Every structure is written in C-alpha cells, then in structure tokens.
C-alpha cells in the first residue's frame, strides 16, 4: 500500500504536470477530493471528476498550464510551479491560527485541515482556526 496517499496525489500531479499530461488519475478518497476542490477553486487545476478506472474509484485531475512560448523550448509555464507536502506520517505538523504561514507573500497558498474542514490559509485565517498544515502550493 501507499504510506501517504495525499503525498502520493500531490506527486502524481507534480509528475503529470512536468510532462504536460492532459489529466492524471489518483485513487479516490473523500479527503483527497476535498483537497482538489481547493485546488480547483484557486485555479491550479481545471477541475476534476470521479471516474472508474477498471473497477475502482479514481479522480481524473485535469491539469492546467500557461501559453506556448518564445525562443528555444516552447513549453509553457506551469500553473502549479510548486506543490509540496508538509505534514507527513512520521512528522505531522499542526499550527495555530496565529501560526498559519503565508505562501509567497500571498501569491501562493497553504492548505490546512481544520475541524471546520479543509481550508486555504485565508479561509482558515478568516474562520479564525488552525489545524494540520497539509501542504503549500504556488
């Protein structure tokens, strides 16, 4: 089995985008889906949808990129330049609202998991709560 399904996902995505895949499938879990929603809403992916690869539930994650480019190497810029796991089995990271980070002076996001559900570093700061710092994305 996978030891960390969220990191598995964050990477399937990190990988897929580096070779400009169209979409990418990841085994499904409510928690994973919950993270995609933030991912979608903040405009990092085009969105996702439940599908059934073989006989088991996955989540096509439609990736998104910038426009073709000039000079050598026309490959487009990435929407997801950076996506990294923070809390991990073996080293869970929890923060208080006063301790929620600020990814790239705001140009990026942190996805916390609170008792008020999965939120971004703002949705969390707004609702005045903290929790498990899941990852940062920019």
């Amino acid at each position: 089995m996978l030891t960390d399904p969220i990191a598995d996902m964050l990477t399937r995505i990190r990988n897929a985008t580096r070779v400009y895949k169209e979409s990418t499938d990841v085994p499904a879990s409510r928690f994973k889906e919950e993270i995609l929603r933030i991912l979608a809403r903040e405009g990092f992916i085009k969105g996702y949808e439940r599908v059934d690869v073989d006989g088991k539930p996955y989540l096509r994650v439609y990736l998104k990129y910038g426009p073709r480019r000039q000079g050598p190497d026309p490959r487009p810029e990435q929407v997801i330049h950076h996506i990294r796991r923070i809390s991990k089995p073996g080293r869970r990271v929890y923060v208080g609202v006063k301790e929620i980070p600020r990814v790239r002076r705001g140009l990026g996001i942190a996805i916390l998991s609170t008792s008020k559900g999965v939120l971004t570093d703002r949705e969390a700061r707004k609702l005045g709560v903290g929790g498990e710092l899941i990852c940062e994305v920019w």
């Binding site: 073996g90 080293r91 869970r92 990271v93 929890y94």
Partner: protein, 104 residues
C-alpha cells in the same frame, strides 16, 4: 486539582497495591514528531478490587507509602491483556541485550 491519570494494571503481586502503566503523547520539543513516552505508578487498592488487565483512572492522593501517592479512582474498562502483553514482552527482551542469556 488532584491530577487524574488513566492506565493499565500491569502488576498486582503486591498487597493492596497495583502497578498502573500510564502513557502520554506529545510533540518532541525540537523535532515535532508526536512521540509516546510512559510511566508506571503504584496505586492504592485496599480492597484488592482491581485485577491484572484493568484500565483504571488514578488520582493524586495523600502518601500511602514511599513510592506510592495514588489511589485507584475507578475502573474504566475490564480485562484486556493485550496491553499487559506489550509490557511483559518489552521487559522480556531486556534479557536478550546484555552479556547473559535471553530470547529474540
């Protein structure tokens, strides 16, 4: 308030006294990782009411003896040697790590 602790009775070879193993968890001060350390308490059991394998609450009390400042408050859940087991074994491995004999 008199501190209250919950734990497992791992020994009762004493008169009116049982040994309660109490675990606790916390973030390592420098490495964050939640680590789990534990400690044993000799609690007062005047009625010889508690048996090996009981998960009990323990309450800070007035000294009964040296090495004994707690009384069994109440039974949380009866029998469950799975816990007594870890302990017994974790202690048994001690033989296999010195210079004499033991078991792997």
């Amino acid at each position: 308030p008199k501190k209250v602790l919950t734990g497992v009775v791992v020994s009762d070879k004493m008169q009116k006294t049982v040994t309660v193993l109490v675990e606790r968890q916390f973030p390592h001060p420098l490495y964050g990782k939640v680590i789990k350390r534990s400690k044993k308490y000799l609690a007062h059991d005047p009625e010889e009411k508690y048996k090996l394998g009981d998960v009990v609450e323990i309450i800070e009390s007035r000294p009964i003896s040296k090495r004994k400042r707690f009384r069994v408050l109440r039974l949380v859940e009866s029998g469950r040697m799975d816990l007594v087991e870890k302990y017994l074994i974790r202690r048994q491995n001690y033989q296999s790590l010195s210079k004499r004999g033991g078991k792997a």
